[model samples]
Every structure is written in C-alpha cells, then in structure tokens.
Target: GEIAQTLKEIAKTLKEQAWTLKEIAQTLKG
Candidate 1:
C-alpha cells in the first residue's frame, strides 16, 4: 500500500507538470 501511494503521488506530480509544460508550449507557439 505504501508503494502504491508513492507511485500515485508521483503520477499526480507528473500530470501537473505536464499541464504546466503544455501551457508553456502554447505560450511559445503563439
């Protein structure tokens, strides 16, 4: 259960970062 929780947290962080990078990409493209 601890491993599962850790992996979930990491995935959530990656998802947020992906959103951030997507926003930056959009800004650069414009």
Candidate 2:
C-alpha cells in the first residue's frame, strides 16, 4: 500500500533523528 511506504520512510527518519539526538547527548556529556 502507498501508506506503507510513507510509514517506512517516516520510521527511517525517526531512527536517524534519534541517532542524531543520541550523538548530541553524548557530545554534551563528553
């Protein structure tokens, strides 16, 4: 379904954004 692709992309983006946030937090802690 078309919505499946959209959700997949959103999940990918959320993962990337979460990773980015983790990096930022690590930087702050370090």
Candidate 3:
C-alpha cells in the first residue's frame, strides 16, 4: 500500500509539473 501511494503521488506531481511547464512555454511564446 505504501508503494502504491508513493507511486500515485509521484505520478500526480509529474503530471502537474508537466502542465506547469506547458503554461510557461506558452507565456514565453506570447
């Protein structure tokens, strides 16, 4: 259960970070 929870948290953080990077890139382009 701990491993599963840890993996889920890692995935969620990574997804959030990826979206943030996309937003940054769009702002830079504009």
Candidate 4:
C-alpha cells in the first residue's frame, strides 16, 4: 500500500521530469 501511493507520485515526477537535477555546483547568479 505504501508503494501504491509512491508509484502515483512517481508518475507526477515523470511528467514534470523533476528527477532531472544535477546542479552540484554553485550557480553564482548574484
């Protein structure tokens, strides 16, 4: 049951591609 809820959330991230984060460095956008 816990994973059932988890998979639903996974679908959302897949749509938004929210898992695509690799910003390990400083942006320094000041």
Candidate 5:
C-alpha cells in the first residue's frame, strides 16, 4: 500500500513537470 502511494505521488509530480516543460517549450518555439 505504501509503495503504491509513493508511486502515485511520483507519477503525479513527474507528469506535471513534463507537462509544464512541454507547454513552455511549445510556446517558446511558436
């Protein structure tokens, strides 16, 4: 249960970071 919780948090952070980076890069490129 703890491992799943950790993974969920990690995935959420990583997804947000990747999404923000992608958005920034797209705006800069365009």
Candidate 6:
C-alpha cells in the first residue's frame, strides 16, 4: 500500500518536470 503510494508520487513529480521543461522550451522558442 505504501509502496504504491510512493510510486504514484514519483510519477506525479516526473509529470510536473515534463510540463516545466515544456514551458521552458516554449519560452526559448518565442
């Protein structure tokens, strides 16, 4: 149970990073 929750947290963090990176890329492009 706790192990699964930890995995979900990791996935959420990665998704956040991906969006942040996307925003940075768009800023550079603009």
**Cα lDDT of model 4 by residue, 1-30, tens digit:** 999999999898886664343332334432
lDDT at 30, model 3: 100
Candidate 6 lDDT by residue in tens digits, 1-30: 999999999999999999999999999999
* Deviation of model 2 at 14, angstroms: 0.2
For all predicted structures, in order, the TM-scores are 0.85, 0.90, 0.88, 0.47, 0.68, 0.85
RMSD of 4: 5.5
Instruction: Give the per-residue lDDT of model 5 (tens digit) for 1-30.
Output: 999999999999999999999999999999
Error of 4 at 1 (Å): 1.6
> Top model by TM-score, which number?
2
Any runs in candidate 2 off by more than 4 Å, and if so which? Answer: none
Over the full model, what C-alpha lDDT does candidate 5 score relative to the true structure? 1.00
Lowest-lDDT window of 10 residues in candidate 5? 14-23
The predictions' CA RMSDs to the true structure, in order, are: 0.6, 0.5, 0.5, 5.5, 1.1, 0.6
lDDT per residue, candidate 3, 1-30, as tens digits?
Answer: 999999999999999999999999999999
**Candidate 2: tens digits of C-alpha lDDT, residues 1-30:** 999999999999999999999999999999
How well does candidate 6 score on lDDT at residue 1? 100
Candidate 6: C-alpha lDDT: 1.00
Q: Candidate 2, TM-score vs. the true structure? A: 0.90
Tell me the RMSD of model 5 versus the true structure: 1.1
Enumerate residue pairs that collide in model 4.
Answer: none
In angstroms, give how far residue 11 of model 1 lies from its true place.
0.6
